[PDB]
Each structure stands twice: as structure tokens, then as C-alpha cells.
Design a protein around this ligand. Structure first.
Ligand SMILES: O=c1cc(O)n([C@@H]2O[C@H](COP(=O)(O)O)[C@@H](O)[C@H]2O)c(=O)[nH]1
Ligand SMILES: O=c1cc(O)n([C@@H]2O[C@H](COP(=O)(O)O)[C@@H](O)[C@H]2O)c(=O)[nH]1
Lengths: 218, 219
């Protein structure tokens, strides 16, 4: 169906692990972004309440990057807890199979939230097992009506293939830009938005880093 | 040398509120010294629940977080988890060797354990995990991983996993009870069984745990 709009096509990966730094750095770049990806590094350090804190302080969409990868019954519980904490969307692994994905879709439909299917990863180890399964995982998502996908900026031809599988109407976001070597502009040939973590949050000047990224893709 | 689990029985504590989780665990505390805590409880009550279990029950805690990210992020997850007091963490092997090593690095630094999840118990595991499982297990063996998780619901797969990891490795196995796995059959290959809802949702959890141990008193 209709997919979300991400301001400036840029999603902040907020993986700092203390609340003060996470809030401060996010504050520094709040003018450039309306969507923040929060994962386990921050949540396990500060608690699930950090999600509602971000939404209230910044008025942003929160994607919970929890790479959900359990059996269906447990996946439903994880999704329910996560959406109860205010997350707008959750990222789910496809490698555990269709029942595990459907469990997440069920909860997202009930609660009016979104699932992102992680089809392929950005790190070298992804080549061992994930890469060979990635096209089939993406097709599994398409066949189940998944609208939102995550694929790797560090493998542009794989990202291009993913876009071909999911079609032009699906929403695609892509990590590995900056620290992992992915290029903002090239990634946006295929992705609707890029995800950027440390090259912003570890920068001497995070606002300048975000502004520079946006300048390069204006 | 690997850990010893009292009565070869690990409680999967997947209740999602603190009072029920603590109470039910209290009911069965005499039967077990090792509890597996996952995201259902942790995301509902906070990471402080791990230290609470260790202090109240004196148990080993396995954090079932199915860690499945890039190496940099895996390191962060493991550090947060071990800082919260977890004795061990469960890590997926499907994201590959660098991602597993990141977890081993932190576990070595902090004096804790990694369990490698090689194969899963639910039907969807057939789609992608099953075909990779022997290679994931071999990857673990080649990296010196000593602790493994494999499925009670696929006994011949569990047997194959034991053949790959050898007799000296430690193997725990979920899917017993609710998912149809049998305690005794599973313990032919696994060092311990993991049991969740068939204990924690029972009308009488202590009776359920006692019944399970009674059925394996022989082993
Ligand atoms: O394939 C993937 C999937 C991810 O979610 N990620 C996540 O995206 C972020 C990347 O951060 P960074 O820009 O600092 O490399 C991290 O939160 C990481 O866990 C990734 O790097 N590769
Ligand atoms: O392959 C696997 C791996 C698991 O960790 N688990 C976990 O083991 C537990 C099984 O609980 P139960 O006995 O209620 O089915 C759950 O916490 C689940 O997430 C599993 O069921 N299958």
C-alpha cells in the first residue's frame, strides 16, 4: 500500500549506549531528520522507556531495530512489547522463515504499526549463509505483502537486485553508509532512505556530518 | 570443561510481568539452577530483571537474545548483557563467523559463555536454517565454541548436531512440551532440555516440573 515518508531520505542509527549522549547527539541533528532507528545497544542499556522519550522529545518516528529472529510465539511477544513501548516499526529477520515473519505481521496489523523485512546484511559474514538465501527471503516478503525492506549499501548490485524483486512501490532502507563504506548517493539509486550511524554520532560535529551528507544528496 | 545444569532441566521463563515470572520461578526453584530469560521478559521489565533472578534464586542465567547483527553491534549487545549479569548469551550462527567471533571476544573478556544456535524448532526453520545448520555447527566447532542450541522437535537433526560437535561440547535443546518434543528422547543427545510454557502455564508449575524430572529420573 502507501508507504512512510522519511524526511531528507536520512535515518539516524542511534547506537550510543547512554541516555544523555543519545539524546544530546539526536538533539544536535534533529533539524535534519524525522526518523530514528533505535536498536538493542541503547534499549538494553537504558530500557524500553527510551523509545517513548525519543518520540516525545523529538516528535520522530522510531524504527526498533531488534532483528527479530525467534519462533512465531516468541516473535509475537517481542513485537507486542515493542509496539506497546511506542515503536512505529520493527525490523525482523527473514531467515527464520515465513511463520516467524507472519507472527510479526499479525501483531503489526492489530496495533497499526509496520514491519521491515531484513533480507540481506552489510557485513562480510553475510556472505556465508544470508547472501545465498537473500533473493528467496525477499520474494517470501513480497508474497506475504510485506511493504518495507532493509538491504545493504555495501553491496550495491545486491541492493539493486533487491529493488527489482520488491518492485517500485515497496519501501527500502539501507544501512552501511559511512562507517562501513557505503556511499549515500549511490545507495539512493535503489533505496528510499539511507541509514547512518557512527559517521554522524561519533563525529566531532554531528550536525555538520548530517548536513554534509544531505548536501551530497541534495 | 562445560557448565553443569541441575537435573538437566532449564526453565524458559517467557512470562512478561515481573510478579508472575518471579512467582512461577519461585514455585519451581527446587528443581532447577539454570533459567533462560529472553526478550519477552526483558523488554517488558528491563535488564535489571537478570540481576533480580540471580540474587533471589542463586541461578545461572542464559540470556536468550538470539543475537543476529553485524559484528560491531553484536559486541555492544553482548557487553550490555554481560554487564547486566548474564552468565551466557545465545547467538545466531546464520549471520556468519565474524558476527559469532564478536560475541566470543566479549565473552572471553568478561569470563562468560556463548551458546551457538545452529538450528531451530519451528516449521519455518525448514526454509533457510535447516539447509545451513550443519555448516553453522561446523563453523562453531572450528571457532572453538563449546555450547550449542539445537531442536528437540527434529530428533535426527539433533543427533546429527551431536555428531558434529562431538561428545565434549555442551548441547541444550528447546521445543520440549508445548512444541511436542519428548524429554527422554531429547536427552539421548542433549545435555539439558529447555522447557517453557508446559511448566510456566501449568495449573501447578511445580507439579509439571516434578513430573518432567520423574519421567527422566533414569537419565
Ligand atoms: O545489514 C545490516 C543491518 C543493520 O540493521 N545494520 C545496522 O545499521 C547500523 C549501522 O551503523 P553504522 O552507520 O554506525 O555502521 C547499526 O545499527 C547496525 O546494527 C547494519 O549495519 N547492517
Ligand atoms: O529453536 C528454538 C530456539 C529457542 O531459543 N526457542 C526458545 O525456547 C523457548 C521454548 O518455550 P516453550 O517450551 O514454551 O515452547 C522459547 O523461549 C523460545 O523462544 C525455541 O523454542 N526454539
Amino acid at each position: 500500500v502507501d508507504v512512510m515518508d522519511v524526511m531528507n531520505r536520512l535515518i539516524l542509527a542511534m547506537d550510543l549506549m547512554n541516555r544523555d549522549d543519545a539524546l544530546r547527539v539526536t538533539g544536535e541533528v534533529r533539524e535534519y531528520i524525522d526518523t530514528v532507528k533505535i536498536g538493542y545497544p541503547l534499549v538494553l542499556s537504558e530500557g524500553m522507556d527510551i523509545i517513548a522519550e525519543f518520540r516525545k522529545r523529538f516528535g520522530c518516528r522510531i524504527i526498533a531495530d531488534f532483528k527479530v529472529a525467534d519462533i512465531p510465539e516468541t516473535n509475537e511477544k517481542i513485537c507486542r512489547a515493542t509496539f506497546k513501548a511506542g515503536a512505529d516499526a520493527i525490523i525482523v529477520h527473514g531467515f527464520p522463515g515465513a511463520d516467524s515473519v507472519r507472527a510479526c505481521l499479525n501483531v503489526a496489523e492489530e496495533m497499526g504499526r509496520e514491519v521491515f523485512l531484513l533480507t540481506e546484511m552489510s557485513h562480510p559474514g553475510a556472505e556465508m549463509f544470508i547472501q545465498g538465501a537473500a533473493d528467496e527471503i525477499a520474494r517470501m516478503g513480497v508474497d506475504l505483502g510485506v511493504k518495507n525492506y532493509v538491504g545493504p549499501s555495501t553491496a550495491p548490485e545486491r541492493l539493486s537486485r533487491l529493488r527489482e524483486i520488491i518492485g517500485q512501490d515497496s519501501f527500502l532502507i539501507s544501512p552501511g553508509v559511512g562507517a562501513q563504506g557505503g556511499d549515500p548517493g549511490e545507495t539512493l539509486r535503489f533505496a528510499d532512505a539511507i541509514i547512518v550511524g557512527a559517521s554522524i554520532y561519533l563525529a566531532d560535529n554531528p550536525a555538520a556530518a548530517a548536513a554534509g551528507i544531505i548536501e551530497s544528496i541534495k
